[PDB]
Amino acid sequence: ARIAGINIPDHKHAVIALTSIYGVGKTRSKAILAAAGIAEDVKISELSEGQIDTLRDEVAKFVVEGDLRREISMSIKRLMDLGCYRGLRHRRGLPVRGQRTKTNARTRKGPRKPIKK
Amino acid sequence: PRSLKKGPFIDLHLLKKVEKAVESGDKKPLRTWSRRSTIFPNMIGLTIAVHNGRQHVPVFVTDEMVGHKLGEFAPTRTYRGHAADKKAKKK
Amino acid sequence: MKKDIHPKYEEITASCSCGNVMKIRSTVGHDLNLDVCSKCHPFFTGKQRDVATGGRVDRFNKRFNIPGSK
Amino acid sequence: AKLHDYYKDEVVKKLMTEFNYNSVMQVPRVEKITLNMGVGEAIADKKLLDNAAADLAAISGQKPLITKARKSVAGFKIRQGYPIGCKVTLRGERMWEFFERLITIAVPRIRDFRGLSAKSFDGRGNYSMGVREQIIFPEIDYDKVDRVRGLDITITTTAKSDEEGRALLAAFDFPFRK
Amino acid sequence: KAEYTIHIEVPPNPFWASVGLSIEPLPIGSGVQYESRVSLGYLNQSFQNAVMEGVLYGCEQGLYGWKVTDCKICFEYGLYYSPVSTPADFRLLSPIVLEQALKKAGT
RNA sequence: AGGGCUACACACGUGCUACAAUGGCGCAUACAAAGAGAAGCGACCUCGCGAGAGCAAGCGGACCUCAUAAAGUGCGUCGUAGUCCGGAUUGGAGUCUGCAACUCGACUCCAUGAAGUCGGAAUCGCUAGUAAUCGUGGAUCAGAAUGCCACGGUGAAUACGU
RNA sequence: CGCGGGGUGGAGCAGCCUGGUAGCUCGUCGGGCUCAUAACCCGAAGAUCGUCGGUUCAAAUCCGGCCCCCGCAACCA
RNA sequence: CCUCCUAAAGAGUAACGGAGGAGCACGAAGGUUGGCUAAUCCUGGUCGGACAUCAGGAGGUUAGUGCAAUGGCAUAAGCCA
């Protein structure tokens, strides 16, 4: 198990876990649990194989993590590409977002080192 | 990311030229200082472009470009430094 | 054949026509006919009259005058 | 193996007429899948090579056995023949049954973009690919819940063109790379 | 062309700073031509300039060592410090700015 | 009219925020001061996941709203796992003022995701309703602060010696 | 167209006893620090180990050619 | 003292004559029996690196040979059990 990407946690509650399917934060996790008809919470260890699965399936309503991602990766490529600000940024490796650049960033410039501009 | 008010700005300082363009063809680029103004369906299929501060920068508008602002086409910015940019090119 | 593990198909090929936590007929794409493309074209593919969340209906007759609360 | 049984019963009889051979002896087949598991640099650690042999001990009933450096450009301590991988050469029933675990139980391992590469065939009847993770075949549906390592593939066929490579086993539900 | 300053950093500190010029070769037989940037109101009161008296002093400096011909000289910018500078500094400064850069770049 | 003041492998001064567990999260729950509002502030009520919008009592504020102030108190849950912490970055969508949010504003929702394990040579504020620590309001202000000015909540340790 | 020793990061020096880069110390660079800098203190970077070729899984390290530095040989009569 | 060349097609053979090696190693690097066959380049794939491996093709022995080099070596005098 699988539901998730071969993976599922475990002792974690579940609303937590299910999130490592990806494309699924708390909002979703609660939801698709729920839906499914199960639950949030119960540990992932307390759900049966038929409940897991029924969950899965119900998940699915969401895309696979590879995909989400990719869609994110192709969205970045795209802005670059279209040649917009972002594209120019992406790309670069600089903050898109409106941050900032005199200080900070870093997240991105990386670590750190004196300029040779 | 992010957003702006729904029904985005078009624009008159651009629209006055867009209505002329589609009749004139494209033969020279439209372009203008407006940016921001939104790219609308629409002004698609011609070269605009746009001032940025700066010079006018020609770009043909497909679409894929609708809902963006004219100034995104574009750059105002340059520097540099580390990055900036390509490696890759030589001049 | 100096066998170190035993191959068996009965636990893994039975009821494989459906998708479940133990086996699935096929993977993503090909036989599953999955689509993986990207697109843009924002706002203008829909109707351009769109409005915010609010208590009123479309083409309403009035608007409460805030200074007229006195 | 059901994949080879279907291929001889249905597909070979059609390839006979699609390529219009004079003899039934001209129709293509897979000869062997030879493998490597070329993780490399493992002479400096040994436990990485033992863990790669323990993944190959679970893909088939056959025993794991080392592959070695020949040009040996990196260097560690011993000259030339330092180990890099753990092989297992599959043929006939031991390769046809493995390709039948793909997209039936190994569905999270195999993606559309990681399918059969139609451009990678050659008229010599030689092929190769990477799968970047280990893919096991136990007596039941099971996974060892361990990752890190991956496997690479080497295949020989009787195909006399790269177009007959694209026809060999091509009726199965395994995706094609694009 | 580029600029020259006399500023120092080791003592308490400063002894500032400074001037920048354009010195550019002209058509043969054009002779010697003058412009400022800052002398509109700021360089600037006797300082206009300086600086011109500085170029005339600079005619007894160089690499070979003497006279100007290419050429036109332009006083593009600079900065005095009020409690140490005078007409300058000027600048004394201005034929050092002209000599250095002429040395940098070549004559 | 458009651009720039906001660019960018840097460094610093001053500020914020986290690394959690005498903390976070979900639910239940107690006790404030102060201040603005005549093309302005605003409950009940209605619409939406929500910013917000609609509808609209009240008022020029000892007459109203921000507002169940939060820390704190009750209950479940986490066991040091880079997490049930942190949430920079980054994709998508919605709301807002305004001629207009592209470079380059604010707010909201979904998703994604990194440094960070309490930090060197070193250093600064404070003697009690103080420091430490929790929240609130206003000027300026089409819109728009983690700064500034003012506010109330909880509330220490130690003071030999000179 | 001899012989012996030498050729290391900005600078001096260790090494090799046939190898597995980068040591020690001054300098440099940023930081703590000072009114500021010398300087103390903290931390980081560097480099075709003369060079081209040879041996080797691996060469600054072993070996040949060559370029450069210093010393020795460099007439008895 | 060994190998190639000096060396002149029976044979021997010089000069601080030109080049390279020898001061030991191996209980497996020995006997015997069965079988096997390369440097290098191209082709194909990726965690798989770098130019690194498995497989196939070309090459058709160049490789390998306990220790430089010639001679010799596939019926192997090479290699594995």
Tab-separated table of N, CA and C in Angstrom, chain A, unseen atoms left out:
chain	number	residue	atom	x	y	z
A	1	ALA	N	3.125	-5.042	3.612
A	1	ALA	CA	2.076	-4.776	2.584
A	2	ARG	N	1.936	-3.809	0.319
A	2	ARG	CA	2.313	-2.983	-0.857
A	3	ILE	N	0.790	-1.250	0.000
A	3	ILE	CA	0.000	0.000	0.000
A	3	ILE	C	0.824	1.304	0.000
A	4	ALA	N	1.863	1.398	0.838
A	4	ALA	CA	2.687	2.602	1.006
A	5	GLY	N	4.064	1.995	-0.940
A	5	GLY	CA	5.283	1.781	-1.732
A	5	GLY	C	6.235	0.753	-1.113
A	6	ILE	N	5.701	-0.424	-0.746
A	6	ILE	CA	6.380	-1.516	-0.004
A	6	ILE	C	7.129	-1.065	1.272
A	7	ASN	N	6.617	-0.021	1.939
A	7	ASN	CA	7.248	0.646	3.086
A	8	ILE	N	5.142	0.477	4.376
A	8	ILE	CA	4.194	0.829	5.452
A	8	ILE	C	4.846	0.694	6.857
A	9	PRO	N	4.651	1.656	7.788
A	9	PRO	CA	5.233	1.599	9.137
A	9	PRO	C	4.575	0.563	10.073
A	10	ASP	N	5.043	0.546	11.323
A	10	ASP	CA	4.525	-0.240	12.452
A	11	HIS	N	3.592	0.330	14.690
A	11	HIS	CA	3.374	1.047	15.971
A	11	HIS	C	2.855	2.500	15.884
A	12	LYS	N	3.040	3.200	14.761
A	12	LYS	CA	2.516	4.559	14.522
A	12	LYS	C	0.992	4.551	14.377
A	13	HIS	N	0.340	5.655	14.750
A	13	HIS	CA	-1.105	5.865	14.537
A	13	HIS	C	-1.422	5.845	13.034
A	14	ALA	N	-2.572	5.318	12.621
A	14	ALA	CA	-2.868	5.026	11.213
A	15	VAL	N	-3.308	7.431	10.870
A	15	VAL	CA	-3.260	8.728	10.169
A	15	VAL	C	-1.825	9.173	9.863
A	16	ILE	N	-0.871	8.894	10.758
A	16	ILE	CA	0.560	9.153	10.534
A	16	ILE	C	1.146	8.113	9.573
A	17	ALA	N	0.947	6.826	9.872
A	17	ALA	CA	1.573	5.708	9.166
A	18	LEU	N	0.064	6.099	7.257
A	18	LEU	CA	-0.356	6.115	5.853
A	18	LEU	C	0.332	7.211	5.017
A	19	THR	N	0.853	8.280	5.636
A	19	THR	CA	1.409	9.430	4.892
A	19	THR	C	2.546	9.062	3.931
A	20	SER	N	3.346	8.027	4.228
A	20	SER	CA	4.451	7.581	3.357
A	20	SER	C	4.009	6.792	2.106
A	21	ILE	N	2.720	6.813	1.737
A	21	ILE	CA	2.285	6.658	0.337
A	21	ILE	C	2.705	7.843	-0.564
A	22	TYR	N	2.890	9.023	0.046
A	22	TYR	CA	3.130	10.343	-0.551
A	22	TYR	C	2.018	10.867	-1.484
A	23	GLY	N	1.910	12.196	-1.570
A	23	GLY	CA	0.714	12.888	-2.063
A	23	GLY	C	-0.413	12.954	-1.023
A	24	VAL	N	-0.106	12.681	0.249
A	24	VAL	CA	-1.053	12.485	1.351
A	24	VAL	C	-0.429	13.015	2.648
A	25	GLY	N	-0.824	14.226	3.041
A	25	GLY	CA	-0.609	14.763	4.382
A	25	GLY	C	-1.723	14.336	5.342
A	26	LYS	N	-1.790	14.971	6.519
A	26	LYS	CA	-2.798	14.657	7.551
A	26	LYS	C	-4.231	14.765	7.013
A	27	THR	N	-4.517	15.782	6.196
A	27	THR	CA	-5.873	16.074	5.705
A	27	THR	C	-6.379	15.023	4.721
A	28	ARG	N	-5.564	14.576	3.754
A	28	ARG	CA	-5.947	13.448	2.884
A	29	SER	N	-4.975	11.936	4.570
A	29	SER	CA	-4.853	10.696	5.348
A	29	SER	C	-6.103	10.400	6.186
A	30	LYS	N	-6.583	11.368	6.983
A	30	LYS	CA	-7.799	11.178	7.797
A	30	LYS	C	-9.069	11.017	6.954
A	31	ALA	N	-9.139	11.711	5.817
A	31	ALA	CA	-10.258	11.630	4.883
A	32	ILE	N	-9.209	9.725	3.708
A	32	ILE	CA	-9.188	8.432	3.010
A	32	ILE	C	-9.356	7.233	3.960
A	33	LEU	N	-8.884	7.333	5.212
A	33	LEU	CA	-9.188	6.354	6.269
A	33	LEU	C	-10.696	6.295	6.579
A	34	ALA	N	-11.361	7.453	6.655
A	34	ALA	CA	-12.813	7.541	6.822
A	35	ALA	N	-13.103	7.218	4.385
A	35	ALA	CA	-13.664	6.653	3.155
A	36	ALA	N	-12.416	4.574	3.614
A	36	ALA	CA	-12.192	3.135	3.780
A	37	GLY	N	-13.695	3.334	5.753
A	37	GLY	CA	-14.530	2.900	6.880
A	37	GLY	C	-13.761	2.497	8.146
A	38	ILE	N	-12.546	3.024	8.344
A	38	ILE	CA	-11.651	2.689	9.468
A	38	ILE	C	-11.159	3.918	10.255
A	39	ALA	N	-10.783	3.684	11.516
A	39	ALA	CA	-10.336	4.710	12.462
A	40	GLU	N	-8.629	6.428	12.791
A	40	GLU	CA	-7.402	7.212	12.571
A	40	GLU	C	-6.404	7.149	13.742
A	41	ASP	N	-6.907	7.077	14.980
A	41	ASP	CA	-6.104	6.966	16.211
A	42	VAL	N	-6.141	4.507	15.916
A	42	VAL	CA	-5.626	3.128	16.042
A	42	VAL	C	-4.221	3.029	15.448
A	43	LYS	N	-3.347	2.210	16.032
A	43	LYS	CA	-2.034	1.928	15.439
A	43	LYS	C	-2.193	1.154	14.131
A	44	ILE	N	-1.287	1.378	13.182
A	44	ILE	CA	-1.244	0.653	11.897
A	44	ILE	C	-1.114	-0.872	12.091
A	45	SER	N	-0.515	-1.292	13.211
A	45	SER	CA	-0.392	-2.688	13.658
A	45	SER	C	-1.729	-3.344	14.053
A	46	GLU	N	-2.754	-2.554	14.401
A	46	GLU	CA	-4.071	-3.038	14.859
A	46	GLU	C	-5.068	-3.271	13.707
A	47	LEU	N	-4.847	-2.644	12.546
A	47	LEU	CA	-5.630	-2.889	11.331
A	47	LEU	C	-5.330	-4.280	10.742
A	48	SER	N	-6.390	-5.015	10.400
A	48	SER	CA	-6.312	-6.323	9.730
A	48	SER	C	-5.936	-6.211	8.247
A	49	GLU	N	-5.536	-7.328	7.641
A	49	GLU	CA	-5.158	-7.401	6.224
A	49	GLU	C	-6.322	-7.041	5.284
A	50	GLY	N	-7.565	-7.389	5.639
A	50	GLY	CA	-8.760	-6.998	4.877
A	50	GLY	C	-9.078	-5.502	4.973
A	51	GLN	N	-8.815	-4.876	6.124
A	51	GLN	CA	-8.932	-3.421	6.295
A	51	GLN	C	-7.840	-2.668	5.526
A	52	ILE	N	-6.596	-3.162	5.544
A	52	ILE	CA	-5.488	-2.564	4.780
A	52	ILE	C	-5.679	-2.775	3.268
A	53	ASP	N	-6.212	-3.916	2.820
A	53	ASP	CA	-6.617	-4.104	1.422
A	54	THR	N	-8.770	-2.989	1.893
A	54	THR	CA	-9.873	-2.033	1.665
A	54	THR	C	-9.326	-0.606	1.513
A	55	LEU	N	-8.351	-0.217	2.342
A	55	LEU	CA	-7.669	1.078	2.256
A	55	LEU	C	-6.808	1.193	0.983
A	56	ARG	N	-6.115	0.117	0.580
A	56	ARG	CA	-5.342	0.001	-0.678
A	57	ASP	N	-7.478	-0.229	-1.862
A	57	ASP	CA	-8.483	0.016	-2.901
A	58	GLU	N	-9.003	2.132	-1.732
A	58	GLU	CA	-9.559	3.480	-1.557
A	58	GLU	C	-8.552	4.596	-1.899
A	59	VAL	N	-7.256	4.404	-1.614
A	59	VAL	CA	-6.180	5.358	-1.978
A	59	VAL	C	-5.947	5.515	-3.490
A	60	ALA	N	-6.650	4.750	-4.335
A	60	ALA	CA	-6.691	4.928	-5.791
A	61	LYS	N	-7.858	7.070	-5.330
A	61	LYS	CA	-8.222	8.489	-5.520
A	61	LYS	C	-7.015	9.433	-5.666
A	62	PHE	N	-5.817	9.006	-5.257
A	62	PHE	CA	-4.562	9.764	-5.365
A	62	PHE	C	-3.568	9.118	-6.351
A	63	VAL	N	-2.626	9.914	-6.872
A	63	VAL	CA	-1.581	9.447	-7.810
A	63	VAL	C	-0.410	8.778	-7.076
A	64	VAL	N	0.353	7.938	-7.786
A	64	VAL	CA	1.595	7.334	-7.261
A	64	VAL	C	2.693	8.388	-7.071
A	65	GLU	N	3.597	8.174	-6.109
A	65	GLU	CA	4.614	9.176	-5.754
A	65	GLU	C	5.542	9.550	-6.916
A	66	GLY	N	5.951	8.588	-7.750
A	66	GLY	CA	6.816	8.864	-8.903
A	66	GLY	C	6.147	9.764	-9.947
A	67	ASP	N	4.819	9.681	-10.087
A	67	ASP	CA	4.062	10.568	-10.973
A	68	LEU	N	3.635	12.038	-9.032
A	68	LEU	CA	3.627	13.317	-8.314
A	68	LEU	C	4.978	14.043	-8.413
A	69	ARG	N	6.089	13.316	-8.261
A	69	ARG	CA	7.458	13.850	-8.380
A	70	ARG	N	7.289	13.514	-10.812
A	70	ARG	CA	7.352	13.894	-12.237
A	71	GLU	N	5.379	15.332	-11.925
A	71	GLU	CA	4.555	16.533	-12.099
A	71	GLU	C	5.218	17.788	-11.519
A	72	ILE	N	5.761	17.699	-10.302
A	72	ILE	CA	6.552	18.759	-9.657
A	72	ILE	C	7.796	19.089	-10.499
A	73	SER	N	8.542	18.071	-10.946
A	73	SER	CA	9.776	18.254	-11.735
A	73	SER	C	9.492	18.882	-13.104
A	74	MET	N	8.443	18.424	-13.791
A	74	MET	CA	8.043	18.965	-15.090
A	74	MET	C	7.451	20.370	-14.946
A	75	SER	N	6.785	20.683	-13.834
A	75	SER	CA	6.362	22.053	-13.508
A	75	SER	C	7.541	23.024	-13.366
A	76	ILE	N	8.650	22.582	-12.764
A	76	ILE	CA	9.886	23.371	-12.660
A	76	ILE	C	10.530	23.539	-14.042
A	77	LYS	N	10.679	22.454	-14.818
A	77	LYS	CA	11.221	22.532	-16.189
A	77	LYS	C	10.361	23.401	-17.118
A	78	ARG	N	9.031	23.369	-16.968
A	78	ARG	CA	8.060	24.243	-17.655
A	79	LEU	N	8.572	26.109	-16.132
A	79	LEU	CA	8.850	27.508	-15.778
A	79	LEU	C	10.189	27.984	-16.363
A	80	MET	N	11.217	27.131	-16.326
A	80	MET	CA	12.523	27.414	-16.929
A	80	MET	C	12.436	27.554	-18.457
A	81	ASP	N	11.709	26.658	-19.127
A	81	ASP	CA	11.485	26.678	-20.578
A	82	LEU	N	9.644	28.286	-20.216
A	82	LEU	CA	8.837	29.488	-20.449
A	82	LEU	C	9.685	30.777	-20.356
A	83	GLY	N	10.826	30.728	-19.656
A	83	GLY	CA	11.766	31.844	-19.513
A	83	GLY	C	11.282	32.969	-18.586
A	84	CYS	N	10.259	32.709	-17.764
A	84	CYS	CA	9.775	33.640	-16.743
A	84	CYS	C	10.780	33.791	-15.586
A	85	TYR	N	10.581	34.777	-14.707
A	85	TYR	CA	11.499	35.055	-13.590
A	85	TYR	C	11.675	33.853	-12.639
A	86	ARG	N	10.598	33.107	-12.326
A	86	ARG	CA	10.697	31.856	-11.532
A	87	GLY	N	11.460	30.728	-13.568
A	87	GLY	CA	12.338	29.916	-14.406
A	87	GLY	C	13.793	30.372	-14.428
A	88	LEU	N	14.054	31.675	-14.550
A	88	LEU	CA	15.415	32.226	-14.576
A	88	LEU	C	16.129	32.161	-13.216
A	89	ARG	N	15.388	32.154	-12.102
A	89	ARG	CA	15.869	31.770	-10.762
A	90	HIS	N	15.238	29.392	-11.092
A	90	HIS	CA	15.424	27.922	-11.111
A	90	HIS	C	16.620	27.493	-11.986
A	91	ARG	N	16.826	28.131	-13.151
A	91	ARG	CA	17.949	27.893	-14.093
A	92	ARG	N	19.341	29.011	-12.411
A	92	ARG	CA	20.527	29.417	-11.635
A	93	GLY	N	19.604	27.959	-9.879
A	93	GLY	CA	19.488	27.312	-8.567
A	93	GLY	C	19.178	28.279	-7.415
A	94	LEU	N	18.550	29.426	-7.702
A	94	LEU	CA	18.277	30.510	-6.747
A	94	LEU	C	16.781	30.602	-6.351
A	95	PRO	N	16.445	31.263	-5.221
A	95	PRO	CA	15.079	31.312	-4.684
A	95	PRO	C	14.016	31.920	-5.622
A	96	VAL	N	12.895	31.218	-5.825
A	96	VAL	CA	11.860	31.595	-6.818
A	96	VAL	C	10.635	32.294	-6.224
A	97	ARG	N	10.475	32.255	-4.897
A	97	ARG	CA	9.317	32.775	-4.145
A	98	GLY	N	10.242	35.028	-4.308
A	98	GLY	CA	10.413	36.456	-4.016
A	98	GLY	C	11.428	36.809	-2.916
A	99	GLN	N	12.179	35.834	-2.394
A	99	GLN	CA	13.155	36.045	-1.323
A	99	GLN	C	14.305	36.986	-1.740
A	100	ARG	N	14.861	37.716	-0.760
A	100	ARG	CA	16.092	38.513	-0.919
A	101	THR	N	18.269	38.039	-1.964
A	101	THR	CA	19.468	37.253	-2.338
A	101	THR	C	20.780	37.823	-1.787
A	102	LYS	N	20.793	39.100	-1.363
A	102	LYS	CA	21.949	39.750	-0.705
A	102	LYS	C	22.359	39.002	0.574
A	103	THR	N	21.367	38.467	1.286
A	103	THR	CA	21.469	37.575	2.456
A	103	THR	C	20.443	36.429	2.343
A	104	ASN	N	20.466	35.474	3.284
A	104	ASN	CA	19.402	34.479	3.511
A	105	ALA	N	19.913	32.935	1.686
A	105	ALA	CA	19.664	32.039	0.555
A	106	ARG	N	20.853	30.314	1.897
A	106	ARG	CA	21.693	29.121	2.145
A	107	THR	N	19.653	27.786	1.831
A	107	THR	CA	18.817	26.668	1.345
A	107	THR	C	18.780	26.494	-0.179
A	108	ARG	N	19.291	27.468	-0.950
A	108	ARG	CA	19.374	27.438	-2.424
A	109	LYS	N	21.591	28.506	-2.473
A	109	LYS	CA	23.023	28.687	-2.792
A	109	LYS	C	23.922	27.554	-2.280
A	110	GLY	N	23.494	26.836	-1.240
A	110	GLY	CA	24.340	25.895	-0.502
A	110	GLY	C	25.308	26.581	0.481
A	111	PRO	N	26.307	25.844	1.010
A	111	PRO	CA	27.226	26.327	2.044
A	111	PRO	C	28.063	27.547	1.623
A	112	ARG	N	28.447	28.341	2.629
A	112	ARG	CA	29.206	29.593	2.482
A	113	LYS	N	31.025	30.152	0.942
A	113	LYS	CA	32.381	30.266	0.353
A	113	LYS	C	32.566	31.659	-0.291
A	114	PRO	N	33.708	32.357	-0.110
A	114	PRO	CA	34.002	33.660	-0.732
A	114	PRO	C	33.688	33.766	-2.236
A	115	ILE	N	33.178	34.927	-2.671
A	115	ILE	CA	32.884	35.210	-4.089
A	115	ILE	C	34.143	35.359	-4.956
A	116	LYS	N	34.045	34.876	-6.204
A	116	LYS	CA	34.975	35.158	-7.320
A	116	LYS	C	34.195	35.607	-8.571
A	117	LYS	N	33.231	36.507	-8.342
A	117	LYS	CA	32.258	37.024	-9.324
A	117	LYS	C	32.948	37.814	-10.443
